[PDB]
Amino acid sequence: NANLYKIWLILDPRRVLVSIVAFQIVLGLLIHMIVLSTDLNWLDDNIPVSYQA
Amino acid sequence: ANLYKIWLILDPRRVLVSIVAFQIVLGLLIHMIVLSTDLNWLDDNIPVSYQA
Amino acid sequence: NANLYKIWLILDPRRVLVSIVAFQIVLGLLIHMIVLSTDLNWLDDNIPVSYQA
Amino acid sequence: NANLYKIWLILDPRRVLVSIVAFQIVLGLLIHMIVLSTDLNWLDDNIPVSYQA
Amino acid sequence: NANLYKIWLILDPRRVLVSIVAFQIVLGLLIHMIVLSTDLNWLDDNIPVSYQA
Amino acid sequence: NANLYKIWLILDPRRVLVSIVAFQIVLGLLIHMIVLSTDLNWLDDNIPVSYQA
Amino acid sequence: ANLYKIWLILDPRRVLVSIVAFQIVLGLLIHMIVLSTDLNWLDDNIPVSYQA
Amino acid sequence: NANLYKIWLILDPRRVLVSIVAFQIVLGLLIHMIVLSTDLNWLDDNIPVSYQA
Amino acid sequence: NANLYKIWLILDPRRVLVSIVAFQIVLGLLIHMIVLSTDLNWLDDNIPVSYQA
Amino acid sequence: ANLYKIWLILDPRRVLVSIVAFQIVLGLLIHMIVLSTDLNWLDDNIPVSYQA
Amino acid sequence: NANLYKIWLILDPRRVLVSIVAFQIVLGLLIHMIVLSTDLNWLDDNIPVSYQA
Amino acid sequence: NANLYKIWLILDPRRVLVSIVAFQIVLGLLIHMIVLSTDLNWLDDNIPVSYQA
Amino acid sequence: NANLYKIWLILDPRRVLVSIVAFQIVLGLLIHMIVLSTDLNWLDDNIPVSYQA
Amino acid sequence: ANLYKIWLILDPRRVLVSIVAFQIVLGLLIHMIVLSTDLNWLDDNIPVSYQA
Amino acid sequence: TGLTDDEAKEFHAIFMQSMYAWFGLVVIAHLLAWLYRPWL
Amino acid sequence: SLTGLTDDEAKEFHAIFMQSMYAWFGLVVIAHLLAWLYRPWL
Amino acid sequence: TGLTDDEAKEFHAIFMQSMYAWFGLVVIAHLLAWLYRPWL
Amino acid sequence: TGLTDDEAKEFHAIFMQSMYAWFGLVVIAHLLAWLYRPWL
Amino acid sequence: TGLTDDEAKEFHAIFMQSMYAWFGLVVIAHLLAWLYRPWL
Amino acid sequence: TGLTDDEAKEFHAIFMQSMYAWFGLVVIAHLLAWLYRPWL
Amino acid sequence: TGLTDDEAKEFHAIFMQSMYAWFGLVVIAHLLAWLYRPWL
Amino acid sequence: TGLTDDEAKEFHAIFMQSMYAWFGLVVIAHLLAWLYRPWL
Amino acid sequence: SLTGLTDDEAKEFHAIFMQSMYAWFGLVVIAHLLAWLYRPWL
Amino acid sequence: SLTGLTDDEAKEFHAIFMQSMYAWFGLVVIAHLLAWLYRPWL
Amino acid sequence: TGLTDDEAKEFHAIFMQSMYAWFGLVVIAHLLAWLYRPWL
Amino acid sequence: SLTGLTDDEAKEFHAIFMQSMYAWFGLVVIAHLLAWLYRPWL
Amino acid sequence: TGLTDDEAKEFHAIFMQSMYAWFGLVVIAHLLAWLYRPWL
Amino acid sequence: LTGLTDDEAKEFHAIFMQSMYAWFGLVVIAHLLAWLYRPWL
Ligand code: BCL
Ligand code: BCL
Ligand code: BCL
Ligand code: BCL
């Protein structure tokens, strides 16, 4: 809609930005945790070579 | 046709905050629920197994 | 009776609506979990085909 | 007696209705949970057809 | 005695009825749980027939 | 003595009645549970007949 | 002979309440103690065993 | 000394009597429990006869 | 010294007596606990005779 | 081009404190995470084993 | 030094005496318990004779 | 920039110094503990000679 | 320096003395336990003669 | 050369108290750490075992 | 409690009537339960 | 009174409460009849 | 408690009557229980 | 609650209409679920 | 406690009478228990 | 809430438009997920 | 405590007399217990 | 919130352009991650 | 004084305290003599 | 403004913040280049 | 503490005398304990 | 100025802070050089 | 602390003297302990 | 800030430096003795 800019007359910009930043950082950490525990792991998969040997 | 008066009872700001929080929590919960079944897309060796 | 519309002169509409919404969401989640626990499961039942294979 | 309608001059109607609603909902949930665990279960009894097989 | 109707000049009626109702409901639940655990059970006793088999 | 009726000029009647009622109910429950555990049990003793069979 | 002045120091009502409570608790405790010895009167198959 | 009666000008008689009574009752209970655990027990020692037989 | 009687101008007699009596009772109980557990026990040593024969 | 107004909403001091704390915590977390994989640089006997 | 008697113009005598008494009692108990657990025990050492046997 | 010295018009110097000192001490302890558990240990590696043996 | 006697214009003497006394007593106890735990024990080492036997 | 002004920011009394407490705690910690290695001086049977 | 005497009389009458009705219902229910599953 | 309700309000509330409770009991009875026709328990 | 003397007399009379009725009921119940399942 | 009579009547009308729509949606959903996996 | 002297006398008399009655009841009960199940 | 009537109408219009856009996105995503990994 | 001197004398007399009676009862009870079950 | 209308317009413009830049960077990163390790 | 006692009261309390402490110690000594005559421990 | 800063102060702070952030990112990039030259992980 | 100089001096004299008596008693007790059970 | 320091005080503090930090980093570098000379880890 | 300068001098003198006496006693005790049980 | 004047800071700094240097000298001597007893490196 063209009159969507009035959303900032209801929501306080400062809290919106702080919540966005915190939620994005937490989501990044959580998704990295989730991906690390599958077969898509990039650290402990001996590519290119194995270094503990 | 007079449903637009629902905002004369419920405060819009709290409604929007609750909707956003509930939708995010529901998305997380449903993704975790689906991950644990046989519909998993990460640890299902498609297209190729990478650890091996 | 035909004078049932006076129930809103005793109960506050706002709290009634909030309680209804919360109770319905909680009941929906609870019933979906209960149905998932039984043998009516639709996710992990190998229909139409097994994917972890 | 025929003068029972004075029971609302001692008990407040609003709290009476709220307590009735809450108690009935809790009782319904509790009775369903109790009946589910016996041999009257309607979900996990393979009727009409077993779906996980 | 015949002047027992003065018992309500010492005890407040509203709290008396609230306590009676709560105590009776709790007693009913307790007696049902007690009876269920004995050999007088009516649910898991395979009468008239067995539904899980 | 014959002047025992003065005991109510020292003890408040209302709290006396409330304490008596509560103590008697608790004692009844406790004695029924204590008797149930011994060999005087009347529920799970297969008299007149056994119903779980 | 002047022992009746003991009630000018101790409050009568609290004395009576304490006496009643202590006696009830003592009765329960002594019945518990006796119930666990060989003086038990309930589970001693006299006059006849009923769970049989 | 002969002027020992002044001991009540320092210690309050009421608390003295209450403490004496409470301590004597607690000591009686404690000594009875202590004696019951030794071979001086008078209840479970089959004298004069054994009743659980 | 000969002017030791001034120690009561520093220490309050009442609390001194209460502390003395409490500490002595606690010490008596503790020393009986300690002695009862050694081979100096007088209760459970079958002297003069064994009563729970 | 008017992004410099972001400091008329966010307080400069708390922003700097939060950045410093978050960066330190992230550095510790990533070093610990890397230490537990096969990319470890301490317990890999390179260039030589010292305990032996 | 000869001017040590001024140490009571800094430390309050009453608390000093109370602390000394409490610390000495605690130390005496602690040292007796420590010595009891070594081979210097005087109670359970069968000297001059065993009493339980 | 060349106007970085204005950073002390925003951050209080005293708290900055205290935080720096505390963080450096904690980091030193943490890094000295982390290295000790690896094969770079300098205490328990029998160099130049074993002392317990 | 020769003007070290001004250290008491910053540190309150009373708390300094109390802290010194408490720290020294605690240190004495701790070092005694540590030395007892090791091979330098003087109590349970059967010197000069073995008691308890 | 103007380093003597650090006492115009930091209070001397708390500085000395913190220094003393930290040094005592560090001394205790390092003695415990050294005691548990093979550099122990108490239980190393030198110059002679005493409980033997 | 603040109740007068006539209010006490009326409350006692209604309380007695309700308690007797409740007891009659319990008695009927126990008669049915005994007819179905005797316990004594 | 204690609650503040008048007498006519008490009468009206009692009438509506009785009607609603009777409707609820009728629905429960029908549901139990259906459940007995499906899965007898007694 | 604030009670007068006549009120104390009336309360004592009613209390004794109720206590005796309760004890009579308990005695009858125990008689029936002994006739069913003797324990001593 | 402070509501007048006309406001209560209007709220009742809208509440009844919305609850009926919700119940119709639920009924359709259970019809589909029964057509997929009969449970009774 | 605020009690007078005559009140103290009356309370002491009633207290002693009640204590003696209670002790007599206890003694009778213990006699019956001894004739039933001797413990000493 | 303090909102007027015109503000209520405007908020309702924007809320409904945004909710419909969100639902359209959800149904497109579910169509893609069904074309990838059928579950029913 | 607020007690006078005559009150202190009276309380001391009664306290001593009661303590002596209690000790006599304890001594008699211990004599009986020794006649039943010697422990030393 | 106290914001005027022109301030709301300016904030909305900057917020939208920043969100679009962030989404573009995320899309590029996901393209690289797919070119390295395909998951679907 | 801190406790509020005068000097004569202090003297009287000291005399009575010493008398009571000595009586208590005498009783303890007699009891320990009897306990030694029964069960020597040293 | 809510924070209380003027416009020129905001501009100066933004300039210095950008300069410092870019320097920090350059150092991070160099460190990651060295770490890749030592132990390749991808 | 509020003490004057003469009070401090008198307290010091008595404190030293009492501490010396206590130490003498301790020394005698350890002499006896060494004559019974030599630990060193 | 939130912290209440003048411009000249800020300049002097920055100079002293920079000097002390550089000295600390020099000591750290020397210590790490010695540690690498003794026990190489990379 | 409120102390003057002469009081500081006096306290320093006494503190140093007492600390030196304490250290002398510790040194003597450690000499005896080394003469009994050498540990180094 | 702390209330100290400009000369008190100089005096405190001089005494603090002297005491810290003495403490460090004692530590160095103790570590020298420990190295002659138990060489750890
Ligand atoms: C093989 C190893 C060697 C050894 C190697 C070394 C080396 C190397 C060093 C020491 C040092 C010390 N060793 Mg060593 N040491 C050994 C075995 C011991 C044994 C033992 C029983 O085995 C003991 C008791 C000690 C004790 C000591 C201390 C004398 C000293 C540490 C003091 C300190 O930390 O300063 C504390 C500093 C302060 C400034 C404290 C000031 C005191 C204040 C006034 C106290 C007030 C109390 C305060 C407020 C706290 C309050 C507490 C609460 C009220 C409870 N070592 C063995 C034999 N040891 C160190 C040393 O000598 O330093 C000179 C040192 O460098
Ligand atoms: C086989 C299963 C599929 C899958 C099946 C589905 C299905 C079906 C759906 C999703 C949806 C989502 N999936 Mg997916 N999804 C998969 C695996 C993932 C993984 C992962 C690491 O594996 C992640 C991180 C995600 C993440 C996401 C989100 C983009 C989205 C849920 C957001 C939400 O809750 O909105 C709630 C947030 C708000 C209401 C806040 C307001 C919205 C803000 C302002 C706008 C942000 C973008 C918005 C979420 C739109 C997303 C579209 C994206 C551009 C793709 N999916 C796999 C590959 N996924 C849902 C979706 O796409 O919604 C459109 C959805 O219906
Ligand atoms: C074999 C079993 C079927 C199944 C059988 C049923 C049956 C039967 C029902 C549902 C219903 C629902 N199912 Mg289903 N459902 C299945 C698996 C799922 C899965 C999943 C990941 O597997 C999800 C996320 C859902 C989710 C849903 C919700 C859309 C809905 C419950 C919402 C609610 O409680 O409203 C409560 C919320 C409120 C009252 C708030 C007020 C209304 C708000 C503003 C709007 C709510 C959105 C509305 C519910 C959307 C409905 C549109 C379509 C019917 C989807 N189902 C499987 C495949 N499901 C219920 C339903 O459809 O209701 C209409 C329902 O009766
Ligand atoms: C073999 C056993 C049968 C079964 C036997 C029975 C029997 C017998 C009864 C129920 C009743 C109920 N059952 Mg059933 N029920 C079964 C399995 C289910 C399952 C399931 C997922 O398996 C669900 C979700 C339900 C749900 C329900 C509810 C509709 C209802 C309890 C509501 C309540 O407590 O009102 C309490 C709430 C209030 C008092 C609040 C006031 C009223 C509010 C405003 C509206 C309430 C909703 C109303 C009950 C809707 C009626 C729907 C129709 C009856 C279908 N049943 C199986 C299939 N069920 C009871 C019932 O039907 O009551 C009429 C009942 O007597």
Ligand code: BCL
């Ligand atoms: C073999 C053992 C017997 C048995 C032996 C006894 C004996 C003996 C006694 C009871 C008594 C009681 N038993 Mg029975 N009882 C048995 C099995 C049961 C079962 C069951 C499900 O098995 C239940 C629910 C009960 C319950 C009861 C209560 C009716 C009563 C205790 C009430 C109370 O504590 O008053 C305390 C409450 C108050 C003081 C509050 C004041 C009074 C209030 C206003 C009304 C109280 C209700 C009144 C007691 C009902 C009496 C009517 C009839 C006597 C039944 N019994 C079995 C069959 N039972 C006691 C009794 O009958 O008392 C008269 C009693 O002496």
Ligand code: BCL
């Ligand atoms: C082999 C071990 C001996 C034994 C060896 C000793 C030795 C040795 C002593 C005791 C002492 C006591 N023993 Mg013994 N004791 C034994 C077994 C027991 C048993 C038991 C059930 O087995 C009991 C209950 C006791 C109880 C007692 C107390 C009478 C007394 C400790 C009271 C106290 O702490 O003073 C604290 C009292 C107060 C603070 C109150 C102040 C005084 C009051 C006003 C007067 C009341 C009487 C008072 C307790 C004096 C006791 C003398 C009695 C007349 C016997 N002994 C066995 C037989 N017992 C101690 C003692 O006799 O003290 C004189 C004592 O020295």
Ligand code: BCL
């Ligand atoms: C195989 C993996 C490599 C390794 C790969 C990397 C990579 C890649 C990086 C680091 C980075 C760091 N590594 Mg490394 N690192 C390894 C092993 C170590 C070991 C160790 C004992 O093994 C230590 C103590 C460190 C410590 C460090 C820090 C210097 C730095 C993280 C600081 C930070 O989070 O700033 C956050 C603090 C702030 C933002 C506060 C503000 C700045 C303050 C005022 C000054 C900070 C000092 C600055 C970071 C020093 C950098 C100079 C040199 C790079 C040393 N690494 C192993 C050997 N390391 C990061 C880095 O170098 O950043 C430049 C980095 O990108």
Ligand code: BCL
């Ligand atoms: C093999 C080991 C020896 C033994 C070796 C020693 C040695 C060595 C000592 C003691 C000392 C004591 N022993 Mg011993 N002791 C043994 C077994 C016991 C047993 C027991 C049941 O076995 C008991 C109860 C005691 C009790 C006692 C106390 C009398 C005294 C510690 C009190 C205290 O800490 O004062 C602290 C209290 C205060 C400072 C408060 C102030 C003073 C108050 C007002 C009065 C206190 C009473 C005073 C201690 C009386 C002492 C007189 C005689 C010495 C008995 N010992 C065995 C037989 N015992 C210590 C002692 O005699 O001190 C003089 C002591 O040095």
Ligand code: BCL
């Ligand atoms: C093989 C591994 C080496 C070793 C490798 C390293 C390396 C690499 C480093 C250290 C550093 C330190 N090591 Mg080392 N270290 C070893 C084992 C030890 C042992 C031990 C018992 O084994 C101890 C107690 C220490 C202690 C120390 C500290 C002196 C210092 C860390 C202090 C700090 O965090 O400053 C933080 C404190 C502040 C910021 C407060 C202000 C400082 C005050 C005013 C001045 C105090 C002295 C200061 C710490 C400088 C020390 C002078 C000399 C370098 C000793 N190391 C072994 C032998 N160690 C670090 C260092 O030397 O820094 C200079 C360092 O880089």
Ligand SMILES: COC(C)(C)C/C=C/C(C)=C/C=C/C(C)=C/C=C/C(C)=C/C=C/C=C(C)/C=C/C=C(C)/C=C/C=C(C)/C=C/CC(C)(C)OC
């Ligand atoms: C104000 O007053 C006016 C003027 C109105 C006058 C009125 C005065 C009146 C009416 C006064 C009335 C006074 C009364 C009735 C007083 C009664 C006093 C009594 C009964 C006192 C009894 C005292 C008993 C004592 C103190 C006994 C002490 C025993 C002790 C401490 C025993 C300890 C034993 C131990 C620790 C044993 C341990 C050994 C074991 C074996 C337990 O260890 C495991």
Ligand SMILES: [Ca+2]
């Ligand atoms: Ca890799």
Ligand SMILES: [Ca+2]
């Ligand atoms: Ca050694």
